[PDB]
Structure formats: C-alpha cells, structure tokens
Design a protein around this ligand. Sequence first.
Ligand SMILES: [Mg+2]
Lengths: 77, 226, 233, 72, 48, 242, 435
Amino acid sequence: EGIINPPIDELLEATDSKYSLVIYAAKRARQINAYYSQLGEGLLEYVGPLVDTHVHEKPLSIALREINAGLLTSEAI
Amino acid sequence: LIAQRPSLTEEVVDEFRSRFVIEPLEPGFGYTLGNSLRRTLLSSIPGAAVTSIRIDGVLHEFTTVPGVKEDVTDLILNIKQLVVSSEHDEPVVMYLRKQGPGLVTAADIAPPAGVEVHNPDLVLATLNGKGKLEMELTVERGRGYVSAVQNKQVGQEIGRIPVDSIYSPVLKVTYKVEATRVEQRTDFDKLIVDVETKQAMRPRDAMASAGKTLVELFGLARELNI
Amino acid sequence: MLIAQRPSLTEEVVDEFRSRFVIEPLEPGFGYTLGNSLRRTLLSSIPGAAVTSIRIDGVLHEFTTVPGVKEDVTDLILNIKQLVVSSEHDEPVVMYLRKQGPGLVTAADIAPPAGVEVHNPDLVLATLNGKGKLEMELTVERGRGYVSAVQNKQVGQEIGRIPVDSIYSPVLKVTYKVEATRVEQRTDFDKLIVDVETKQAMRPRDAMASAGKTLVELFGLARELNIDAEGID
Amino acid sequence: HKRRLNALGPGGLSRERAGFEVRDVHPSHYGRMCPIETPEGPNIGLIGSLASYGRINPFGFIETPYRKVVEG
Amino acid sequence: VLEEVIAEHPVLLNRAPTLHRLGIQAFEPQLVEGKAIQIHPLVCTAFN
Amino acid sequence: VLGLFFLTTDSEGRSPKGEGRAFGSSAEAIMAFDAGDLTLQAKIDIRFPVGTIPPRGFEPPAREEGEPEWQQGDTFTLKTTLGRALFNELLPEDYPFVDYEVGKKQLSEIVNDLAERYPKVIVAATLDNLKAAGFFWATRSGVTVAISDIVVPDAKKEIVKGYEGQDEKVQKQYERGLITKEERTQELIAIWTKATNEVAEAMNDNFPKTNPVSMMVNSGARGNMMQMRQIAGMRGLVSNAK
Amino acid sequence: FLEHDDANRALMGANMMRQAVPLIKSESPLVGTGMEYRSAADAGDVVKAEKAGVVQEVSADYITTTNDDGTYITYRLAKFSRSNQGTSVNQKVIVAEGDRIIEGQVLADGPATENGEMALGKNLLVAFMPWEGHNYEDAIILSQRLVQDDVLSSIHIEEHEVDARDTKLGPEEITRDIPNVSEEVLADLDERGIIRIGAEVVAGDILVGKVTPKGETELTPEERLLRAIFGEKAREVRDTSLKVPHGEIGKVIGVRVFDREEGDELPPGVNQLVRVYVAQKRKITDGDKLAGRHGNKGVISKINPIEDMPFLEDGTPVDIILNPLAVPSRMNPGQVLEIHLGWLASRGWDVSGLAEEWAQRLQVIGADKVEPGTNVATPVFDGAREDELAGLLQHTIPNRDGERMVLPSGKARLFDGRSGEPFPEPISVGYMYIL
RNA sequence: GUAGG
Ligand SMILES: [Mg+2]
C-alpha cells in the first residue's frame, strides 16, 4: 500500500543495476498498460497480468510486483 | 493486596464551581483519571447557542446598522459569547427589538418558552436616540464548536447570516493529587478535580454527562470482548 | 449529536501472549483519554500474585555468595522474580525447594503447597556444581499493581530472608498509539492501536475485559451526581 | 514609508552601482539614520528610516538635538 | 475519487535554490486538510 | 537529538533516585519508571532476553561457568540505564547494543553503519522509530530558557574591574606622552583579548551540565560555544567599519 | 528590551513590524515601548478632533461634535473600504456621548489601534518547550481557542472590475440575459446583470453578466449537426461575463457602477464600468505566517483542540507553544525578558515598605502599586533591570487560592494535556505580543 | 519598485 512496499535490493540484484531496472520495469509497465487499454482488439502479442491485480491499480506497481517475483525475464537485443 | 473501591465526594466553592474528591485511587492513577475527566468534559457536553441571525436593512455582516456605535461585526462578537440553554432539539427563533437611546441587553431579548439566556447582565451594544435595532436569532443546540462556514444552509435568504457558535458551558478544569494517610508502600493518591462552568448548567450534571459518555465508551470496550 | 460511527473493538493476534487491539474510528480528541486510561489501569489496577521475599539456607544478607551453586545470589533474585505464581490465599504463604546433587534446579522441580499454582515449570533457576546443597524457601503474597522491595524486618527476624521486587500485574507492558483515519470525507477520526505484552498465565483480552469493567465502575461512580444523556450510536 | 531615505534613484546611487562602503554604517549615522533597520534583500542598508529626533537642515543636511553642558 | 487515484503515484517535491541533487525528492502523496504542503522532518535538512 | 542525548545520559542529570538496583527485564524496569521510584538516568543492572546481541566491547567478557558459553547471542546481564536499553530497542535486534552517549557525532556514526550493512527498508524504519522516540523524549526532557537559566558568572565583575584598572593606568601613562597611541592600541587589544579569553573560560567553568542550554549545545542539537560566551560573558572586541 | 537583542534579530523584527495586518478587535500590547502612543497619534489613520467641546452624537457612521463657540463638525468614519494591500480600514468609536473633548484628542481608532495606541496584534499566553516535533525547526503550535474566539482573525476585501467597451463589431452589454448558460447560475443577479449585495460567491460564480456584441461564427460540422438535433440557435453574441477567479470565497459588500451617457465621465471607448467588493473573514489557519516582535517567525503547523494544550496548575491553557532551541542560537534573549514581564503585567504586584533596592527604585519611579492587567512601559534603552524582574516576580499578586503560581525562577508546573502526568520539571510561561 | 525565501 505504498511505493516502498517492494524493497529495492532484490530488484537491483535481479537486474544487476539501477538504471537498467528502471527502463526494464517501465517497459513492462507500458506493455501491461497497453494491454488493459486494448478495449477489444485482443492482439495476441499483448499479455495480461501474470500476478493477481486489484480492481483499480497503477500498472507500474504490477510491473514491479512481477520483477520482485522474478518470474519475468529480460534480454538485450 | 488490599481491595478498596473508588468513592466520590462533592463540595461546592462557588455558585458555578465545585471540587470533587476521590481518595481510594491507586498510586499513579489520579493524574490519568483527572486528565481523562478534564478532556472528556471539555470535548463533549450538550449545550445551546445562537447559530444564525438576521438583521433588517442589512445584507452582510460587514456593513453597519444606523443608530449603534457598534458595527454589525461587533454585534457578532458580542453575541458569540452569549450563553443560552435550549430544551428543544429543533431550531427555535428569538427576537431582539430596541428603540430610543440606551444600552441594549441580553435581558431585553424576547425569550421563547423553553429557551433561556443565562447572562442577562451582558451588554450587547448601545443605541442613539435616533437608533433602532431589530434582530432575529436562531437558537440551536449542540456540543463543541461549530464554525459559521458549515453552519450555512439557506442561500436565498440573503438577509440571514451565519455565526460560529460555542455550546460547551464549562469554563475550566483543574485536577490535583495527594498521598493518602493509609500506612502502606503503595501510597494511594487522592484525586481532587475542580470544575468551574458558565451559568448555563451546574458542574454536577456536567460531569454526570461526562461520566455517561466515558462509561458508554468503556462499556463498549468491555462488552465487545469475551 | 450521535457519533457518526460507533466504535467497535477488534483483535489482532501475533502470539499467545502478545496481542494488538484496534478501535474502529472514534470521536476526535477522545483517543488519548481512552488509550492512556486503558494503559494505566491495565498495567496496574488488574490484580495478581507474585513472590515477596526469599530465604536461602546458610547465608547472610551481607553474604551475597551462596556455596555449592555456580551462579550468584543476584541472578537468583532476578530469576525468581521473573517466575510467575498464581495464588489466592490472600495472606502470605511459603513455598519450599529442597534439592541436592549436581544438575539444574528449575521451576518444574519446585514443590508448591496447596492453593498455589506455578504456571511456568520450564524456567531453570539454578545450576549446581558438586553437591547441590540447595534449600530455599520463599514467600508469595497476592497483590495489586507493582510494589518496590521494602525492608519489613524479615532480615532481622531471620538473617537469611531478604526483600525482593514483586510483579502483581498479570501483564508486562502496553504500548498504545493513536493514528488518523479518513471517514465520510472527514479526517477527524482517531484509531487506537494498543499492543499488549502479557505473561503466559493470563490471556490478554481477558485482562483488558477486566480493566474495562473496572473503569466502567470507576466512571459509573459519576452517575451518582445526576442522570444525563449524550448522543451515541 | 513616509520617513524613508531612499538612496536609490535618478541622479544618484543605483543598485548595480552599490558597493561595500556605501552600505555600511558610518560614525556620523548617530541621530541621522537608524543603523539597525533596512530591507534585508539585495538593497541592504541603502534604504533606511530617519532617526527619531532628526530634523532637516534647510540646505539639506540632518541636524540632531543636543543638550548643553557647561562647567560639568 | 481523488483519494482513490493519488496513491502509488510519485510526486517530486523541490525547493528553489536546489544547490545539490538533494533538491528534487520523490514522495508518495497523501491528502490532508488545510492549504499547506506537509513534509517529513528528517528530509528537511537535505533541502536546507 | 536533544531527546536522545537526554536519554543516553550518565548520572547526575538529576537526583539519581532508585540507582543501584537490578531488574529482571526492561518491562519491569519501565513499570518501576512509571512508579516514579527510578529515574531514566540511573545506573542499574538489567537482563536481556535471548537474541539480544551484546555490546561490541562486551564480546570478550562473559559470565563465569565451567562449561563453554556463547553470550554473543544468548541471555546476559549488563550494567546500564533504561535509556540505553530503549535506544537499543529502537535499533534492530541484530545490531549490537550501544551503551555510550549518542550526542551528535556518534549518532551519525551508527547511522552510517546501519546504512552500510543493512537493507534500505530497515534503515527507513529505524530512522522513523528514532524520530518518534526523539520527539517524545524531547517533550519529556523539560529543556527551557529563563532568566535564572542564564546566570552571569559572579567573578566577572571583579576580574573585569581589575582589567579595567589596568586600562586606566595605561591611559595615565599615555596622557604624559610616555607611550605612542599606536603602541597603546596594540597593548590594549592584547589586554582585552586576554580579558575576554579569561572571562570565557570562567563562564565555561561556572555553568553546570544540567541546565538546558548546556544540554543542547553539548548534544550537538543547536548553537555553539561562542554564542554562549556572548550571551553570558562579555562580547569583547568587535570590528569597526573597514 | 532592545538592549538585550542581537542587532541581526532586531533588524528582522523591525522589518517584520511593517507587515502586521489589523484584526477584528485590536488590543494594545501589555508590554511595549512607551512611544507607541505618539506613533499612533501622528499617523493619520486615527481620527482626532480639532476642537475642545462636548460630543453631541456618537454613531458608527458619524460622530458629531460642537465646540463652545458654536461650530458643529461631523466626522464621517470610513467603514470597510479597501486599502492598498487589501485590508479593511474599519474605524471604531471610543468617546462617550457627553464626554468633554480636547483638541487633538483621539475620537476614533484606526485599523490595528486601541484607545489611540498602536495595536498590531494580540498577546498570547505562551510556554517554551518542545512538543512532539510539531514545533520543530521553529514551527509554531497554537491552541484552537484562537480559532474559537477570533483572537487572530482578519478581514480581507478584494475589488476587481469589468468594462463595457464599444469594439469594432459593436458595443458590449451588461445584462441578465447571458447566452449559452443555465438558469440557476444567473440566480442572485440584479435586473441589469449585476450581483446583488450580500450574495456569497465561489469560484465560477457570475458577478456581472457581460456579452460580446458579436463575432464571425463559422459553425462547425459537428456543432452544426448538434444544433440541428437539439434545435438550438447559436447566436453571434458571445459570453464574456466576469467570474470569480479560481480558489476564492467571500460575501459581496458593495458594488459601484459608472456610465458613459450619465454625468459621470469615463475614458474613451468604455461605456460602463462596474467594480465589485468581495469580502471575507480569514481566520487563523494552518499555513498562516506568524511572528513575535523580536523576530521569532514561523508557519503554523498544527492547531490542537483546547484540551491537548499543556495546561497549567489552575487550568489555564497555553495559547501557543515555542521551540526553545531558537533563543540561544539566535542570541536574542530579549523575548525571555518580555515573556516574564508579560506574566508580571497580567498579575498585578504590590510593593510597599519592602526597603529593597529594586523596591526603592520602583517606589521613586512610582510604579509600585499595580493592579492586574494594567499596561506597562519599558523605554528602549531605559527598560527594566533583571533584578527588578526578579523582585517583582517574587512579589506578584496571588491569582487564586493565595498562592503565587510561577516559581521565583520564572518557571511553573505544566500538566501534559494528553498523558496527564505533570511534566518532570517546571516550564517558563508568560504573555508575549504576537503579530 | 518593494517584501519574503
Ligand atoms: Mg527561508
């Protein structure tokens, strides 16, 4: 119920940086926000929330929840 | 080890001030007891006060009524400390009308049945020979403090104006502790709570109400357990 | 007039002895009365039983050392006062402890008399080297609140006996904190969070029920002034 | 604001023209300017109120009243 | 609705001189009556 | 920080009533404190439940027994004050006990340690607890300011008149021209530098350590020595224009 | 007590003494320099009489005087007229009906004035002690009693206007027929499209209804369709009415109108001008700046109820808390002298036959027998000596129960409002002026 | 201009 509820150190050791964590969590947040804002097209590329979500929620909080869970993965081009 | 239940005794020092003593209190209790008693009495206590007024020939509190040296705002400040007692739960109407030269007073005000001002000697303003005061008052009952901003409900009656009001008729409370004559290491303390209040209501019934509130709260605390 | 929302006491348990109690939002400015008063009476007014004096065989009050025991006298005083005793005789009673040989003497090993129950047998009291030699008799007396150790001439009556602090309170500590809540678009509401740390003998909510009843009596004592009504519920 | 002596102005000391020397107090200030008070901003001391008893010489200096002392 | 939407959304508090990077500091919002920002007394000395 | 310094203070801060006693646990110590018999600044013995990491300096010492003992993480008694116990309790359990006065510098040291060795969330929670307790104990400290609080040294007048006495003899040996004005100025400024230094030392000696201004300046709360010098002792030399 | 103050803080106070706003009811300071009377008198805000006669009529609007010679003069007292910074310039009346008057005698106080004497604020009971951090870094705590009794409440009158101008297209019109509006919005207005007197306003409220003469309107396709469906006519006249600027509140107190064709002259083009007065009574609230005479200034950070105040032995609450950590570092101990002298002034003193040096000094000065509440004067450099303060404090009249309530040290016993335990040591308490 | 930072 706050910004600090996901502690940062686990995310940092997961992503091995501070800035990479920011851009990566933000990309995930954008992806999920695009998903919720589909409103009907149902594009296959878009993916729903892997973790449970509230009725009303800020997407980036769910992005950070996913990263803290460690289930979501990153890979550079 | 020794079991002794609290015992309260009363004494009166003035027509509106009284000291109440409880001797059997445990050590280091009289202070917290007196504090809770004081706070509860000040915070909550039913009372009556004027809540919104109307002046003929006046459309806002900023202007002035001819015939009085006191402006309208001065009249607001004069009445806000006027003390009243109202038995009716619903709003009542009171009237103040004065003509000619002389002092206008709380005693002069027209009392409705069941609504009683308790500071007749208070002077509200003064009128010239050419002066005229005509005033409508609304007597409501409540507790604590209510500011005029939330006390406004009529918008069409521009003549009507709200006034912040004060209901609690208690003036001040002061508690003190001592040591009991009983021979023991605990040294039970003797609380003495002195309360002085305005002319509206006797301190005895005031703390009776305070005890009602607080015992209700602690009965809620206890009964909901076990 | 009526309080917009009636309070409603609720519980949150973390351990069989530690607990938290929460008050549903309340009239503003009232939270400190209730919580502080609760704190004081719950710590002190609730009654209970504790040890009052101790007597070791073959030692003097000035002779702090005790033969045959690795530990000193002072740690024994701390350990015995740490012990909880439930008594109801309403007069001083004496409990004995007579053990020999090396080993560990514990609260379990104590033999209590009739009408007195020791709730915690687990506590280890002494560690013995060589022959145990241990013989100790202690006085238990029910009491109210907390009393500091005082000299009652028991040392004069017998040199072995000495005073000790006693903890009649069945509870150990209470920490009450008031915080702000938003209700019906109004923030003028105070939630009470009272954390009670109690010993194993008494269950905390029962103790707070007793405390609430006591305060209810003490403040119903004010009704004798007159009959008056206040908006509620 | 009636009795201020605004040193800023045309044909006179300007804000950019200010220096350490002009702003500071000088031993002649007694009776001719309250050295205590001035705006705290960048115009420190340049503006100052008149002393309590200060009266104005017709030429434009500021006089101060003094009691006369003779033979002690 | 506002009380619903503000939570979990950062806001950057920031003082005017901003001598060093402790000028800009993110915080969680929280409604409060009155007309003044409130602030946590520990961070005050970072802003000076 | 004034509150914390008031809390982790040595004796003599008051009349140390209830000093020289042992207590089973911090809880029963708080019970006594509420009873009023004991004062927060009073050297006592206290126990500690298991898991209480002992002081770093307490690691070599331990209790006396014929069997191996590991007091680094089991029960141990210790001589300290209720305040030091409370201050440790604010700190997380794994942190070793702190028994020395905090003041200002030491608080920053321990905060640096915590920020170094521990996770961020624990740091934030610890700082918040510190703030709450600090405000609470500042409320309870009773620091104030009053006319009797700032007491002028009794000796000052005497010494200064003697110094003043010196001054006028020099002026006398100047009115005959025996010394130049410049040399007179140099010796006067030296004389009064000596005088103000000596009066500052006198005032520093006079004030007890219990009064609020000393408590707050020594704690590192606010202010510094020369402010006290010029509020109590003479200001001394100042600077004219240019 | 300027002599005991660092110049830096005296400068701060003097710069902060030119910004105090007047209040509803003004009271002269209990402790203060004896020159304030002259400062009030020479300033033109006060209204003094030019003749020595007997007042004939005393009314708020006007006061009539008649000299023995026979000249009758009626002074008109300005009432609730906007100042330069937007504060009321209300003027009271002091003289009775038949009371004799002297030339230059004050007949009516101006703003922030009382009995002809300067009064830039009120005097509060005050105690020095930290309190839960709600007076951290020199923030202030004040009781809700000031919110209760309008002790610190100030009028604020805002005035803004609108102009009817003949533009190229045509003339602008003031009217109650505003286009493209609801009905209730134009509810309290006047016949010609002006807000009545007494009608409270909020952000968005219409004060005076003004409409553009016309404009070239190329109605858009979407809007065209919408009008066609709803059958509404978009007219070239466009709304340009006045509205309250965002974040405001007040009751209208006066409205003035000037007109071109009428005898009143106006600049070119403008056909009619309308000015509206919107007035409020701002009560002391969180965020309001506040400051003592010696420069202790802070922003109010919390207003507890009357109970949480750390109250004193007889039950008098403290009306304001202050962070003591200021007064050592700021090197401005004048305020501690001031607070002690204020407590002294509130409770009178009797000094007769004491034979003490300070007692002798008061007896020769004449300030020996003082009744409670009567004001005092401490000239800027000939003020009261600390010895005098100590002696007077030791000889204060007993307020109640025949006991002196402050200790000789100048510190008294404070009972915590919330916890109820008496505070461990006494605390300093007195009365200081606040602005 | 003049006040606060
Ligand atoms: Mg600033």
